[PDB]
A paper describes a structure:
During LPS biosynthesis, a membrane-associated glycosyltransferase (LpxB) forms a tetra-acylated disaccharide that is further acylated to form the membrane anchor moiety of LPS. LpxB is a glycosyltransferase in the Raetz (lipid A synthesis) pathway that catalyzes nucleophilic attack of the 6′-hydroxyl of lipid X (1) on the anomeric carbon of UDP-diacyl-glucosamine (UDP-DAG) (2) to form β(1–6)-tetraacyl-disaccharide 1-phosphate (lipid A disaccharide) (3). Here we present the first crystal structures of a soluble variant of E. coli LpxB in the apo form and bound to UDP, which reveals a novel glycosyltransferase-B (GT-B) dimer wherein the C-terminal tail of one subunit completes the fold of the other subunit. The structure reveals that LpxB has a glycosyltransferase-B family fold but with a highly intertwined, C-terminally swapped dimer comprising four domains.
LpxB6S was crystallized with one molecule in the asymmetric unit. However, the biological assembly is a highly intertwined, C-terminally swapped homodimer. Each half of the LpxB dimer consists of two Rossmann-like domains with a parallel β-sheet core sandwiched between α-helices. The first Rossmann-like domain is composed of the N-terminal half of one subunit (residues 1–166) and the last helix (369–382) from the C-terminus of the other subunit. This domain is connected via short antiparallel helical linkers to the second domain, which is composed of residues 177–295 of the first subunit and 296–345 of the second subunit. LpxB forms a two-fold symmetric dimer in which the polypeptide chains crossover at helix 14 around the dyad axis to swap the remainder of the polypeptide chain. The reciprocally swapped C-terminal segments wrap around the opposing subunit in an interlocked arrangement. These extensive interactions bury a total surface area of 12,650 Å2, forming an LpxB dimer with an overall ‘bowtie’-shape. LpxB in our crystal structure appears to be in an open conformation.
Numbering used by the authors:
A (entry chain A), B (entry chain A): 5 to 61, 72 to 382
Write the structure that this text describes.
Amino acid sequence: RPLTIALVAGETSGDILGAGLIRALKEHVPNARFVGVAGPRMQAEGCEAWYEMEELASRRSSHIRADLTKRFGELKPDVFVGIDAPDFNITLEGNLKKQGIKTIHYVSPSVWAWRQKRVFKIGRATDLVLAFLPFEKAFYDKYNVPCRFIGHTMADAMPLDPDKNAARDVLGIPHDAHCLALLPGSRGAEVESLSADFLKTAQLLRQTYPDLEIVVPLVNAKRREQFERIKAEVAPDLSVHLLDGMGREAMVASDAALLASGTAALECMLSKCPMVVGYRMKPFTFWLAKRLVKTDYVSLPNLLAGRELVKELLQEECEPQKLAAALLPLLANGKTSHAMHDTFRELHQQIRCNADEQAAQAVLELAQ
Amino acid sequence: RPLTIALVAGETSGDILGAGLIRALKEHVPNARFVGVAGPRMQAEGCEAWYEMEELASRRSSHIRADLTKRFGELKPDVFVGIDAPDFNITLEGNLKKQGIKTIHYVSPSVWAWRQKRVFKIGRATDLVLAFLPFEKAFYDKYNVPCRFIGHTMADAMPLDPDKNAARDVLGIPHDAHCLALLPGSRGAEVESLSADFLKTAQLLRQTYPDLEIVVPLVNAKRREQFERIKAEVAPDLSVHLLDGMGREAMVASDAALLASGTAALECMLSKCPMVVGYRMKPFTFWLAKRLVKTDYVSLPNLLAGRELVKELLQEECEPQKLAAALLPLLANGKTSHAMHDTFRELHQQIRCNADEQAAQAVLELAQ
Ligand SMILES: [Li+]
Ligand SMILES: [Li+]
Ligand code: NA
Ligand code: NA
Ligand code: NA
Ligand code: NA
């Protein structure tokens, strides 16, 4: 049997990675066979599409993963490559590993692996992880998880020395003018807050550069409508170039870029465009996340007790079946409930000090 | 001159703390004088209201803080107590400390102090911090910031052994039935996601407890309308008790509570109500926050370089004047811009490896 590779991609970006992998492999093994969940580019390179990538871009997903667990198990491919899409591929990679199939996960699932347990899962599910960036490999090295640093595909696609004048000709920007790119972000929460402040920033810069060109790449129609509506109020008399996409051209053309996304900062770096990164998130949200990172807890009872006195179910674990399972023993109103009751009473006593009087004493001691 | 205490409160909760402090102080110094920014309860206890607390609950706030900086400086009070409201009081406390006035900050500003620099600011601005909880004092101990643990006022207000049957009589809950409290949260992002899953959780629990009473404390009319609209779709045929406020009664009455807020978990603890805490936040948001906590950076260029190669302005620093100030040197398109250009070129080279070929090699090595 010729080399048989199973592939799963769940987004256009995965389809691009998959197509490039298939071509490079065919240079070494022109008789290789490719099958799995393929997008149009992977199919163009010859991947048999048991399912279309669009079908993964919940109940249907579960059924597909079950069917693929069965069929790949029967096929016994030489290698299975999960291309990103970790919510789908990590579990699938684990099911196939259970059957002795060699698995690779392509792209570090940084957002998905939000706690240590998920790092362990990646290690159990894969024989190797492919990471775009060096600090991602260093991360997995600390966990004894085999990881190969392969570089970033966007660095292969973008030249070391891009042509600023060419990008300006495409966008219609004069070569003698200073140019500022505003990238308020791709997500909604980002655009709302940061759009107004980015516009105000440009207004301030116009006082120094009265002929400053301002280019705003907008990723889709909804995001465009959002930015226009914000600009109508904040700065209706500010002239800017609103673009449909074309963020790469805007960055290559500009003399500086104001970015919301620390992720788009990579493409800005490869564009050789100096940048400033401004970002805001809800303080309450950041405080809660930081509390979890620093203590592994989120609720005050557990911080006061120093253990998981109270059951905390977070992120994917905050799910009806698990919540109900955690509440049943407590609704019983039996021994375990009385034990928690007693502990709550001790903690209550520990923080019951007549705070009003304490505060008054502290004032008086500082005053004397 | 009799004891002269300056107070600033910016919310109802601060007004309550202030009133209790004034009364306790008057027990030791009946001739004490109180002045500052007072709510109705502080005024009832005799606080002279230069400004009303409602006036702080941006341009107006700046003017008031300026006026208070002047007048308190002239008054030279024995002590100034900033009651919570850290966005306003920490700066004011610093201005007064500059003039030799002794300052206390009441309530740990946990959300406000989102990074180490702000901890240093609290220390510089205050002679003493008053913390409700022991782990808050331990935190400030690590920074050599004087902090007194005074206990939590809510623990003084709530009895060690509340009357479950009494709270049930208030709410109209039968004494023989099992009762579940659903507290989907006080904020909007919380209610949206967590409301549906909390309702589904209750539906599951009804399969075991067909006569389970379900009480839902809703903090205001908007939040109520939100929950009702979610319930119309998710579970219109589920009978629940929708309450206007009365979260304390609901928790004292219930046999178990399902809580979104790790903060309301304290009041649940003092109610002696066993609880399960379920919470979700946007993974992308948590990933970004965790990245910042772990590395002090948010943008990929700085993670790749290992320093602040690129200027990052986050939270209160993400502000037009500072953003424009950071962009001016780059728009100049001079020496500093060319230096960043050169560094970007070196980093580009470091991640330019022909990733497609690397991935293909890794597949082939694993297949052989
Ligand atoms: Li105490
Ligand atoms: Li390389
Ligand atoms: Na121009
Ligand atoms: Na959890
Ligand atoms: Na009942
Ligand atoms: Na910053």
